[PDB]
Design a protein around this ligand. Structure first.
Ligand SMILES: *[C@@H]1O[C@H](CO)[C@@H](O)[C@H](O)[C@H]1NC(C)=O
Ligand SMILES: *[C@@H]1O[C@H](CO)[C@@H](O)[C@H](O)[C@H]1NC(C)=O
Ligand SMILES: *[C@@H]1O[C@H](CO)[C@@H](O)[C@H](O)[C@H]1NC(C)=O
Ligand SMILES: *[C@@H]1O[C@H](CO)[C@@H](O)[C@H](O)[C@H]1NC(C)=O
Ligand SMILES: [Cl-]
Ligand SMILES: [Mg+2]
Lengths: 389, 389
């Protein structure tokens, strides 16, 4: 009955939707571990080291339960909240912390190989020792957390590359992989992957708010959208392109990095609307739902250009409650029920929407779509990854 | 007198002693700026984004006054505390923030050239925009601070390479260079450097504590160690090797990275201790003062090996008053007055002591010395950098 605990964290600059992906990366690994030993994944509390990223509202120590449905995840891999780890093991005590990093020697191409090795630390360590020789660190904002040991792993391939190593030194009841973004997916478009991805189902509350918005302002219900919905995700398998979707255009415009990132892969507002109108005409769509990070000045400019834009603006208390990821989820959930969707180039946000649309069963031609930069020369659309059951 | 303002910050992992080096790099940029426009450098508050790195108990927004002598600093370049800047500009408002970064394309060997260019941001920018369109950021832990605009600058050479660009766009009353560590020194061994370096003189109360420790436990005073002291640091010049030093051996052992960094350039505790006793024999020194980061188990073992070791262990309340860099500065100060000194390989802490010793005038043969790895073959010693008065 004595099992082992896996914990992870991601490089602080990474956003909500990248973290959702790394999660599947880590789940791949844990499944590989479970073939041998008893393990359980501990869900890293939400909220970010950089507190200024989410203005005026503190997003901190947020359980997954506020975003995703725990039973839904559990049907895939054994999973527990960090606050629960803290209760089962005596305190917030982590035996081994492994900071993932690349190989310093690099490689000359043709050498590249999936491998993992204990190595000296490349960047100086962000953990440090107290008067008790415990390692103090970020630890998802739980200040009282202590690692017993920290060191670095140089690593290359898919996440499961690390399992032999973790399965060897069994001394560690709890192991944490920091900088888990270093791990790749085992196999991304694959059945194992989809089992996981499908199993992350939004919390009932965010779905309900999103659904009611769909019916009030989008004239969109699951019935009218020919999206038969099922509760247990294991039991929901839908034929491709059967789903119709609400009579509206979903769009995701990402302005955040447009300027300082010197981007040629994102449109001007004026360009974005030209495309949008072309889509509305093509598909006979009266209303467009826009999910955007745009600032007020730029939003007004968009609002004037495209009056029929409908948008979900959380009230102050809604934001205080659902938090940031929460709102993002509603926006995603709504875009995902659109008749047709157009996203932003290489946006992780748009990526999650795709997967979500593929799950609901919407035709790919309506799914993998992106705005072209105004003068962008040859603009390639995102790649369609079909589900495998 | 409407003068421009310069502010900077350094990559968060960076410790206290690398920061003090960067300061001089910046200060050399300011000197080059003063050849044209009226400027003043704003002293970035001490205290760290990653708070768990410091034993300082969330002690933050610390002015340079608690470490360095402000008049002393001001005789080198014009300088003000950050809170003073908030008062003299209108609010906590920085006009332009430049995040310093390396050139995206790297270089081919032989192509390396000092250059600065506005470029697309490589890493995702840590600053983020609010609903008033202002950028919020870490900003030395002052939540109120607002930047008006943010972009990344790719840069290569010495810190003064940024000066011409900074003088072209004059619309910016205040300018902040984030990731300042990307700038090199102008010329490190030279007069200009040494003017800045000599000008950084520890706050009176800190030296007063060290002299107290010296007088008491080390049987050491300036008049006994033949180290005449001079308040006006411009008026302090000593013949090289005129300084004797106290009847003790100063040693700096940094153990922090010994293990996780797989270090071969630092000794095991025994290798350290044997080397110490041999030095005390050779140089006829009665007592030994050790400045180290060793945590309990190690210190315990170090204490058995070297019982005659005297150390600076501040009281709970002392650590509060002087804070972290204070305890460090005291330790450094004490080391700097030893008759003979031996440090740790590539330790910024050691470098800072090196520099302080050259300033007191102690013979180089007694300054630039490091412990060798137990099995380290080459084992180069640190390079003598003379003051040029
Ligand atoms: C941490 O790891 C090292 C290397 O395996 C080990 O020798 C040491 O005992 C560990 N530290 C603690 C506090 O258990
Ligand atoms: C809304 O969509 C439904 C499809 O079920 C359609 O029958 C109806 O005409 C639409 N109503 C409006 C307000 O356009
Ligand atoms: C700020 O700098 C960017 C360069 O990244 C520039 O394009 C933008 O127009 C500037 N904003 C203002 C308000 O001057
Ligand atoms: C202290 O230093 C003096 C040199 O001024 C030396 O002569 C003396 O023997 C030392 N010892 C003690 C205990 O005073
Ligand atoms: Cl969030
Ligand atoms: Mg011995």
């Amino acid at each position: 009955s004595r099992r082992r605990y896996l914990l992870y964290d991601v490089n602080p600059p990474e956003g909500f939707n990248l973290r959702r992906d790394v999660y599947i990366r880590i789940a791949s690994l844990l499944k590989t571990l479970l073939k041998t030993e008893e393990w359980v994944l501990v869900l890293p509390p939400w909220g970010r080291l950089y507190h200024w990223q989410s203005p005026d509202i503190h997003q901190v120590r947020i359980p997954w339960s506020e975003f995703f449905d725990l039973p839904s995840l559990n049907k895939n891999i054994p999973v527990i909240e960090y606050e629960q780890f803290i209760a089962e093991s005596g305190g917030p005590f982590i035996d081994q912390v492994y900071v993932l990093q690349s190989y310093a020697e690099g490689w000359k191409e043709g050498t590249w190989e999936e491998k993992v090795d204990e190595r000296p630390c490349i960047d100086q360590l962000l953990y440090s020792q107290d008067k008790h020789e415990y390692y103090r660190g970020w630890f998802w904002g739980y200040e009282e957390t202590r690692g017993l040991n920290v060191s670095c792993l140089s690593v290359q391939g898919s996440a499961s590359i690390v399992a032999p190593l973790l399965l060897r030194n069994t001394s560690a009841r709890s192991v944490m992989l920091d900088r888990a973004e270093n791990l790749l997916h085992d196999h991304y478009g694959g059945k194992e992957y989809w089992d996981t991805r499908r199993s992350m189902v939004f919390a009932r509350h965010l779905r309900e708010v999103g659904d009611e918005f769909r019916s009030r302002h989008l004239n969109s219900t699951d019935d009218a959208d020919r999206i038969p919905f099922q509760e247990d995700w294991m039991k929901m398998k839908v034929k491709l392109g059967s789903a119709l979707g609400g009579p509206y255009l979903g769009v995701h415009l990402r302005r955040k990095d447009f300027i300082w990132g010197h981007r040629q892969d994102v449109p001007s507002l004026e360009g974005a609307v030209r495309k949008i109108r072309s889509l509305m005409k093509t598909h006979r769509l009266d209303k467009v739902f826009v999910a955007t990070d745009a600032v007020r000045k730029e939003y007004e400019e968009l609002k004037k250009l495209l009056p029929e834009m409908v948008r979900f603006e959380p009230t102050w208390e809604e934001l205080e409650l659902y938090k940031d990821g929460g709102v993002a989820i509603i926006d995603q959930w709504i875009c995902a029920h659109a008749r047709f969707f157009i996203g932003t180039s290489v946006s992780t946000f748009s990526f999650r929407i795709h997967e979500e649309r593929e799950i609901l069963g919407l035709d790919p031609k309506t799914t993998y779509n992106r705005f072209c930069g105004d003068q962008e020369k040859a603009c390639e659309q995102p790649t369609h990854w079909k589900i495998t059951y």
